[PDB]
């Protein structure tokens, strides 16, 4: 009957997907749908499917929907067997995986209970520590020598033992083993440990991770250091480590009241911990190209970019460009044989506090994807590098994300270089010099690439100028890391009644719900797709107007040679080398290829004011 009722749920679902899945009429997407899905999957014959939940919830009034959700672990077998049925019917090596998506609801990891156990659910969080993909049995051919092997079955649920029955023969048993690795079916898998989304956690409860195992072609879909959304397949894993928890803890002591006395006691504690599982993994969290064109056409969209960057911040116009030109980087490629050029860019904002230098930062971690924000002094160490994680268990050498490196080909933002002392700064130097992060700790040696831009905000020795002092002496970070940051864009705020009035006005404006009507010419959402478009260019200047650049380099150092009591610097050749990446940056900005001598002049003047601010 339970077999019969369950089987009824089978037939009901099978009828569902065979019954019309689509009400869309006329222009479409006209019916069916899912048949089209089976067939589109039959195109490349990779044997897994995606079918939406919402439809299924709507059709039957939900009796079937609820019947699936609540008892879902009960109802797996009927479902994939049903899919196998339809496949057998309409279609001609059998591995099938069914994953719903688009649930009506989202549940926080902290809101997970045991009443939703074994039942499909939705959980969104920040992925951490992915783990290399390892095979799994679930179908194995294992038997004794006597009298024959090749029996292939069982080990369904995680055990992993053993053959169920019809041993040996003729030694009939009981017994055990032997397992073949020559005959069995394997799938996947990779484990990932997901964390609660940073923004959500209840004070001061602090985040708590849970573990989600990835089987299915859903493998590798997850990404380290990313928000993701999962659908349930929820289950349980047993845990030895809970003892002295305290109790009272349940046990297995068997009931022997059958049979008769003429095995022993056989007691095994059962202590489980909840760990989520995943069938479906998404990274959530033509008409537009017309807009993109509309952006590249206009002659002002540069200026639009600049003015529209950081609404919260008021003016300065320097650090606007300073922020954007990191998002759009140079060629960072070639020149071989040999050692590779840089490429990317760096900036360190310096100034008397209250200058809202931090607002930029928060705006960058807000705006651009692949951006990590730390306040270090508390880095603390690694932090910006990898642990590496050991053990796992089962071989370990699994690597933590983490901090700096988990943001890669991107903009990492650090407050206060001046607080982190010696230890880590050296590591950062190792990142911005050798470009690679070499990691060896008490175990497996390693090399892990991080190619990144580093935006820092560094407070002066006394938090002030010191206009008369050399900037070299003011910032108070060591020479080698200093010379790799080009360039600083120092800000100091001084009292001007017009500007003062404008500040008070603007700030009071901000703290007013009205008017919040202050708006940038570009919306924060579109500026991303614009930028990502502008990233796909490979700006290259063959143009012989590059000759001009030389004299420009040349024009720059001469007047700055005498006196030496000017802002020098030198001006270092690395600044010639810097003008390049700056140029290419502006090329990225304006979509123009081979650029102009004019844009070169813009990058130039930019560096110039960045110098003069150092003069006094």
Partner 1 sequence: SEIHVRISDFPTIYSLRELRESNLSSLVRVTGVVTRRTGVFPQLKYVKFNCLKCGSILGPFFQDSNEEIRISFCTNCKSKGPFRVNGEKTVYRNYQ
Q: Which residues are annotated as a binding site for ATP?
A: 351-358
- Minimum separation from the CB atom of position 364 to ligand ADP (A): 14
- Minimum separation from the CB atom of position 513 to partner 1 (A): 50
Element (H, E) at 381: none
**Per-residue interface string for the shown chain with partner 1, residues 127-146, x marking contact by CB under 8 A:** ------x-x-----------
Stretch that binds partner 1, among 197-205, 421-429, 443-451, 534-542 (CB under 8 A): 443-451
CA distances from 272 to 117, 232, 241, 247, 251 (A): 12, 18, 10, 13, 12
Q: Does 447 bind partner 1 (CB under 8 A)?
A: yes
Q: Of 98, 446, 531, 576, which one interacts with partner 1 (CB under 8 A)?
A: 446
Q: Does 147 bind partner 1 (CB under 8 A)?
A: no
Which one of partner 1, ligand ADP, none is in contact with 359 (Cβ closer than 5 to 8 A by kind)? ligand ADP
Residue 212 β-bridge partners: 192
CB closer to partner 1, 446 vs 531: 446
Interatomic CA distance for residues 382 and 399, integer angstroms:
12
CB closer to ligand ADP, 52 vs 416: 416
Supply the angle between the helices 573-590 and 301-308 in degrees, to the nearest 10.
110
Cα 53–57–58 angle (5° rounding)? 120
User: Taking Cα atoms as reference points, which of 127, 131, 128, 155 lies closest to residue 141?
Assistant: 155
- Minimum separation from the CB atom of position 132 to partner 1 (A): 9
CB closer to ligand ADP, 432 vs 455: 455
CB closer to partner 1, 446 vs 592: 446
**Per-residue interface string for the shown chain with partner 1, residues 167-196, x marking contact by CB under 8 A:** ---------------x---xxx--------
User: Taking Cα atoms as reference points, which of 451, 452, 469, 448 lies closest to residue 460?
Assistant: 469
CB closer to partner 1, 140 vs 428: 140
- Minimum separation from the CB atom of position 598 to partner 1 (A): 43
Interatomic CA distance for residues 220 and 489, integer angstroms:
41
Residue 214 β-bridge partners: 190, 278
Interatomic CA distance for residues 35 and 204, integer angstroms:
50
Which one of ligand ADP, partner 1, none is in contact with 447 (Cβ closer than 5 to 8 A by kind)? partner 1
CB closer to ligand ADP, 370 vs 419: 419
Interatomic CA distance for residues 477 and 485, integer angstroms:
11
Which one of partner 1, ligand ADP, none is in contact with 135 (Cβ closer than 5 to 8 A by kind)? partner 1
Interatomic CA distance for residues 422 and 431, integer angstroms:
15
- Minimum separation from the CB atom of position 445 to partner 1 (A): 4
Footprint of partner 1 on 63-122 (CB under 8 A)? none
Site residues (vs ligand ADP, CB under 6 A): 312-314, 353-359, 507
Cβ contact 455:413 at 8 Å: yes
Q: How many CA atoms lie within 13 A of 134 on its CB side?
A: 12
Q: How many CB atoms lie within 10 A of CB 487?
A: 21
Judged by the rule CB under 8 A, the positions of this chain that interact with partner 1 are: 133, 135, 182, 186-188, 440, 444-447
């Amino acid at each position: 009957v339970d077999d019969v009722t369950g089987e009824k749920v089978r037939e009901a679902f099978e009828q569902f997907l065979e019954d019309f899945s689509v009400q869309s009429t006329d222009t479409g997407e006209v019916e069916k749908v899912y048949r089209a899905q089976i067939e589109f999957m039959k195109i490349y014959d990779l044997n897994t499917i995606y079918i939406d939940y919402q439809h299924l919830s709507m059709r039957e009034n939900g009796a079937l929907a609820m019947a699936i959700s609540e008892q879902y672990y009960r109802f797996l077998p009927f479902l994939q067997k049903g899919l196998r049925r339809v496949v057998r019917k309409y279609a001609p090596e059998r591995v099938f995986q069914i994953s719903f998506f688009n649930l009506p609801t989202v549940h926080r990891i902290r809101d997970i209970r045991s009443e939703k156990i074994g039942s499909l659910l939705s959980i969104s969080g920040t992925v951490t520590r992915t783990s290399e993909v390892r095979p799994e049995l679930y179908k194995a051919s294992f038997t004794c020598d006597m009298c024959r092997a090749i029996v292939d079955n069982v080990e369904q649920s995680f055990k992993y033992t053993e053959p169920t029955f019809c041993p040996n023969p003729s030694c009939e048993n009981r017994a055990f083993w032997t397992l073949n690795v020559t005959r069995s079916r394997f799938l996947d898998w990779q484990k990932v440990r997901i964390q609660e989304n940073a923004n959500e956690i209840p004070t001061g409860s602090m985040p708590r991770t849970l573990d989600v195992i990835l089987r299915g072609d859903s493998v590798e879909r997850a990404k380290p250091g990313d928000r993701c959304k999962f659908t349930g397949v929820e289950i349980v894993v047993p845990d030895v480590t809970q003892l002295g928890l305290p109790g009272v803890k349940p046990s297995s002591t068997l009931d022997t009241r059958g049979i008769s006395k003429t095995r022993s006691l056989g007691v095994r504690d059962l202590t489980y911990k909840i760990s989520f599982l995943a069938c479906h993994v998404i990274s959530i969290g033509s008409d537009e190209i017309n807009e993109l064109k509309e952006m590249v056409k206009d002659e002002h969209i540069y200026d639009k970019l600049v003015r529209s960057i950081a609404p919260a911040v008021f003016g300065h116009e320097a650090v606007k460009k300073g922020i954007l030109l990191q998002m759009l980087g140079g060629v960072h490629k070639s020149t071989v044989e040999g050692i590779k050029l840089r490429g990317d860019i760096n900036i360190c904002v310096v100034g008397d506090p209250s200058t809202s230098k931090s607002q930029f930062l928060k705006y960058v971690v807000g705006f651009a994807p692949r951006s990590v924000y730390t306040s270090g002094k508390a880095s603390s160490a690694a932090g910006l590098t990898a642990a590496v994680v050991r053990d796992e268990e089962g071989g370990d050498y699994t690597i933590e994300a983490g901090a700096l490196m988990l943001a890669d080909n991107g903009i990492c933002c650090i407050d206060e270089f001046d607080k982190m002392d010696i230890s880590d700064q050296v590591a950062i130097h190792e990142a911005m010099e050798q470009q690679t992060i070499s990691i060896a700790k008490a175990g497996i040696h390693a090399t892990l690439n991080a190619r990144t831009s580093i935006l820092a905000a560094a407070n002066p020795v006394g938090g002030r100028y010191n206009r008369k002092l050399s900037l070299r002496g003011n910032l108070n970070m060591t020479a080698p890391i200093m010379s790799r940051f080009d360039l600083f864009f120092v800000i100091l705020d001084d009292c001007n009644e017009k500007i003062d009035t404008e500040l008070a006005s603007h700030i009071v404006d901000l703290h007013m719900k009205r008017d919040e009507a202050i708006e940038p010419p570009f919306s924060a959402e579109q500026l991303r797709r614009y930028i990502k478009y502008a990233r796909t260019f490979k700006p290259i200047l063959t143009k012989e107007a590059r000759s001009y650049l030389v004299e420009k380099y040349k024009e720059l150092r001469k007047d700055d040679a005498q006196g030496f009591s000017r802002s020098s610097y030198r001006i270092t050749v690395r600044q010639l080398e810097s003008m390049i990446r700056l140029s290419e940056a502006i090329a990225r900005a304006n979509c123009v290829d081979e650029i102009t001598p004019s844009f070169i002049a813009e990058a130039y003047d930019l560096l110039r004011q960045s110098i003069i601010r150092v003069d006094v």
